[PDB]
A paper describes a structure:
[name] is a μ opioid of exceptionally high binding affinity and potency. [name] was the ligand used in the first crystal structure of active μOR. The truncated N-terminus of the receptor, which is unresolved in other opioid receptor structures due to disorder, unexpectedly forms a “lid” over the binding pocket. Another factor influencing the receptor conformation is the intracellular binding partner used, the G protein-mimetic nanobody Nb39.
The third residue of the terminus, His54, clashes with [name]. The overlapping atoms also contact a pocket of strong, unexplained electron density. In summary, the density observed between [name] and His54 is not consistent with non-covalent interactions or a metal coordination complex, and must instead represent two covalent bonds to a non-metal atom, approximately isoelectronic with Mg2+. The use of conditions known to generate ROS, along with previous reports of adduct formation in the presence of ROS, suggests the possibility of an oxygen-bridged adduct here. Oxygen also gave a superior B-factor to Mg2+, both lower and more consistent with its bonding partners, making this a much more plausible candidate element. The structure differs in key respects from subsequent structures of μOR bound to Gi protein, partly due to the use of a nanobody; however, strain within the tethered N-terminus, and its contacts with surrounding residues, also appear to contribute.
Numbering used by the authors:
A (entry chain A): 52 to 347
B (entry chain B): 3 to 102, 110 to 127
Write the structure that this text describes.
């Protein structure tokens, strides 16, 4: 199983290496900056007394951790090997899986929270407390641990043509458990989230569109337009950012694709797109949040 | 014109819970806010919520304990008050917007937090 290491040669064109490096740098910087800024604004001004700010905080920390892995990944790309040893391999793999799932589970959570508010307003009174939002973040972290902790054990460095792969070792037979892992990641990080947010937001919109009021009404149309557009944006961003790397990982499980510049470049691009979700989340879920918006 | 019916107030023991609700059944306005006035004090903001029911806003002194929701299908506003304290003793008023500040105010409900309760 080839993980961090791409079977490469012949060694790349100047322009493709500058491109890929620049890609990893920009995403890392923008991700770290946007998410630290959210954390700062929360800790300083808004304070975390509300459920929505507790979810925002959790999302930003996960997104900041996700992006924190990128410099390790640029060097690994630039050098064509993993130079950081076996301990850092475990730690970075682990952080990377944990926070992919935290990020994604928290953003699902925010969708479910909104569906609950509109479709179950009475239950929303019990669900939308700071206490529950903390319990939910712990539950999501538990769920994330089902993959985050095993990878900590499975991750290791090994030799692979003189060079060093930071990879996952699996029990026997490797071809079962390695493909199960890929499958699970694909369904819990992609399929299930896409279903959750599209169903929750689509049911939310449906309830909203069903409301009458003898007077209304142009105001109601107007509101629905703004909400619908926001739903379409957050879903479309999720899909554009995450679908490429997910599909690419499955395709590689199934067929053998010719090593080429296009293959190498597209792969890093798809990887960067994943981390771009973590860059856009602050915009989508903090800076455009009704209450958070108001500061400063 | 508009007539806001507030329910669910009254007497609670310290640390207890109450659920207020407010409706304009005529669908002539949208109950969206809660204010209160303690004896001797000025009217203060408690909570509000957008039209859609998605986004609540809480006063700092109540954020940890109060939740608000809106039932957009029957135009009902709720306030769930937990862990009630002497500080929460007040007349609570529902505030509503016209479909076209707030435009309408309920006559209020007494919330009394006292150990002489049951
Ligand atoms: C907006 C969303 C829906 C778009 C999703 C596009 C996905 C499916 C695209 C984006 C990049 C694509 C990959 C780019 C390069 C290659 C190398 C080639 O040798 C086999 C196909 C393969 C592996 C592509 C498969 C499909 C792919 C993963
Ligand atoms: C939810 C979005 C689902 C989008 C899934 C898009 C599937 C595209 C796909 O599988 O592409 C075939 C491949 O490129 C052949 O080499
Ligand atoms: C997202 C939902 C469904 C995508 C289906 C998931 C499987 C991805 C399609 C893989 C595939 O069809 O393989 C490409 C094939 O090698 C070309 O010749």
């Amino acid at each position: 199983g080839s993980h961090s290491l791409c079977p490469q040669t012949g060694s790349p064109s100047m322009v493709t290496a500058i491109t890929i490096m620049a890609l990893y740098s920009i995403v890392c910087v923008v991700g770290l900056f946007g998410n630290f800024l959210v954390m700062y604004v929360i800790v300083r001004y808004t304070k975390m007394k509300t459920a929505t700010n507790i979810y925002i905080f959790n999302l930003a920390l996960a997104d900041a951790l996700a992006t924190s892995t990128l410099p390790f990944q640029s060097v690994n790309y630039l050098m064509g090997t993993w130079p950081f040893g076996n301990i850092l391999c475990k730690i970075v793999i682990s952080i990377d899986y944990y926070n992919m799932f935290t990020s994604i589970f928290t953003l699902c959570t925010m969708s479910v929270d909104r569906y609950i508010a509109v479709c179950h307003p009475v239950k929303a009174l019990d669900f939308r407390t700071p206490r529950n939002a903390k319990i939910v973040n712990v539950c999501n972290w538990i769920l994330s641990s089902a993959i985050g902790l095993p990878v900590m054990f499975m991750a290791t460095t090994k030799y692979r043509q003189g060079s060093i792969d930071c990879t996952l070792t699996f029990s026997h037979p490797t071809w079962y458990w390695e493909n199960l892992l890929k499958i699970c990641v694909f369904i819990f990080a992609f399929i299930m989230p896409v279903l959750i947010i599209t169903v929750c937001y689509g049911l939310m919109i449906l309830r909203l569109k069903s409301v009458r009021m003898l007077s209304g009404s142009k105001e109601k149309d107007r509101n629905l337009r703004r909400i619908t557009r926001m739903v379409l944006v957050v879903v479309a961003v999720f899909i554009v950012c995450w679908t490429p790397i997910h599909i690419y990982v499955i395709i590689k499980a199934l067929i053998t694709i010719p090593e080429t510049t296009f293959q190498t470049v597209s792969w890093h691009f798809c990887i960067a797109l994943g981390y771009t979700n973590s860059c856009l989340n602050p915009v989508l879920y903090a800076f455009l949040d009704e209450n958070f918006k108001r500061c400063f | 014109q508009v007539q806001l019916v507030e329910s669910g107030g009254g007497l609670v023991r310290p640390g207890g819970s109450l659920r207020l609700s407010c409706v304009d059944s005529e669908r002539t306005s949208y109950p969206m806010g809660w204010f209160r006035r303690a004896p001797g004090k000025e009217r203060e903001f408690v909570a509000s919520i957008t039209w859609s029911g998605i986004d609540p806003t809480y006063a700092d002194s109540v954020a940890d304990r109060f939740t608000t929701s809106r039932d957009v299908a029957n135009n009902t506003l709720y306030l769930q008050m937990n862990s009630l304290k002497h500080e929460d003793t007040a007349v609570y008023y529902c505030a509503a917007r016209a479909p076209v500040d707030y435009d309408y105010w309920g006559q209020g409900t007494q919330v009394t937090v006292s150990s002489a309760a049951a």
